[PDB]
Amino acid sequence: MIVKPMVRNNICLNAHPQGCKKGVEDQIEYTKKRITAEVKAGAKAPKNVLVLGCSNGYGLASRITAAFGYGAATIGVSFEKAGSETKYGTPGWYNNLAFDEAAKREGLYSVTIDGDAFSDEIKAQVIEEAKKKGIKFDLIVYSLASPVRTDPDTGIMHKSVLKPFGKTFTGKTVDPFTGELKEISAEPANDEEAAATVKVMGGEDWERWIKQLSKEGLLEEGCITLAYSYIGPEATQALYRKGTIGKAKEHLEATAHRLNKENPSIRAFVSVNKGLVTRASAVIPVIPLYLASLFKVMKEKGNHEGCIEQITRLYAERLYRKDGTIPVDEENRIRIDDWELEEDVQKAVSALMEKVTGENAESLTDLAGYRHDFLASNGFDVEGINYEAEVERFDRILE
Ligand SMILES: NC(=O)c1ccc[n+]([C@@H]2O[C@H](COP(=O)([O-])OP(=O)(O)OC[C@H]3O[C@@H](n4cnc5c(N)ncnc54)[C@H](O)[C@@H]3O)[C@@H](O)[C@H]2O)c1
């Protein structure tokens, strides 16, 4: 069967098994080139690391660099739907198969607990798994992006929204394939939707993960733990600062202080990373247009870093650096979005967005790069993969 992109309502349904595998392998070679001994030595290294949300995006790079850069044991946890012989799985199900295969070849320990990380059953599965192998955790990476969360105590399912407060946030959006420059808007969120997004996107659950692992004595002396976040440009402040994602973000970094205060033997940070193309982007205003214009500028300047290039820098120049310290900002946060929000980039992206219209879209913003990122998340448009070739089965990767 010829597997090619079936993208409906700007969301990609299928996934290319070999393309997912090559993706993880390309991210692996990069890690090996970037984390050399001139960078890895003179500083500590992670020995054992739990990665919550391991299967793609920032999760996958965090886990890749940890095992292939710093030769670490890794326990992943993600929510994936497996393949049949004939039924395509979620991109993550293939990415995790690809991660185990290449980590067996190099003789590293890796187990990926498949299932809902918000649940208690999963927390249990890793509690027993870390105990079964003995050694305890020195890096917990909270990297969960999910639109929904079943509460373990109440049992209520919580949807999340991406909306502003007070007045409608309206602005341009750009369909990356057609190049059509449209006009979508996010409408003010009420009070039921506001607390529901803090219930989901905040640090409510991340706190649970740390408390439970602490009473089980599964954390080392001075263990680093970090949750990912995003601040963004001055344009999307109405969603990311004073919006409903904004409030949820503020709860996450409030959890990072509450965690250092209640257990001084652990060190918690929220890492603010760069913006990149995800499943949310399409139906959220001025994010595709921003990101497409952003790649054009950052490619031109040579400070465009994708997922793996971002996280390798993080480990090497924030956590495990010669000096020992963890460089943070004013409100005690790791800053990796430092290149994105540097002003000569921001001023340039703003100029570019004002002079894009119904036809110059492909022409003066990087829609092609945006397409590649959006497709590569599903195993498509990866170089070195011939897509015309038939696909044997959907429940295994091979080569
Ligand atoms: N792209 C951005 O705007 C951006 C930038 C910086 C940081 N972040 C933050 O980074 C964090 C993770 O981002 P990402 O790039 O990994 O997104 P991603 O969608 O690529 O991956 C999310 C992870 O969650 C896992 N999964 C989804 N629901 C689950 C569940 N309920 N239980 C167990 N696994 C589940 C997926 O398998 C995946 O590994 C998010 O909290 C996000 O806020 C986003």
Q: How far is CA 144 from CA 52, 53, 59, 78, 185, in A?
A: 6, 5, 8, 8, 26
List Cβ neighbours of 264 (8 Å cut-off, separation of 6 or more): none
- Cα-Cα-Cα-Cα dihedral of 205, 168, 370, 19, to 10°? 40
Return the biggest CA–CA distance within the chain: 60
Report resolution in angstroms: 3.0
Is the CB–ligand 1 distance for residue 290 below 6 Å? no
Ligand 1 atom with the smallest distance to the CA of 279 is 19
53 lines ligand 1 (CB under 6 A): yes
Pocket test for ligand 1, best of 58, 142, 159 (most atoms within 8 A of CB): 58
> Letter for the amino acid at 46?
P
Token duo for residue 304:
């465009």
Q: Is 293 in the pocket of ligand 1 (CB under 6 A)?
A: no
Q: What experiment produced this structure? A: X-ray
Closest ligand 1 atom to 229 CA? 7
Residue of 317, 203, 321 whose CA lies nearest to 270 = 203
Closest-CA residue to 352 (of 339, 361, 343): 361
Atom 18, ligand 1: residue with shortest CA distance: 57
Question: Cα of 388 to ligand 1 centre, how many Å?
Answer: 31
The secondary structure of residue 110, as a DSSP letter, is E
Domains of the chain (ranges, CATH numbers): 2-399 (3.40.50.720)
Would you state the structure tokens that stand for residue 231, as one six-digit string?
Answer: 């601040």
Cα–Cα distance list, 191 to 163, 166, 251, 333 (Å): 11, 11, 16, 28
Pocket flag, ligand 1, residue 89 (CB < 6 Å): no
Which of 94, 146, 241, 287 for mutating ligand 1's site (highest number of atoms within 8 Å of CB)?
146
| β-bridge partners, 73 | 48
* Backbone angles phi and psi of 75, in degrees to 5: -115, 115
Sign of torsion over alpha carbons 249, 251, 254, 256: negative
305 token code pair: 């870093």
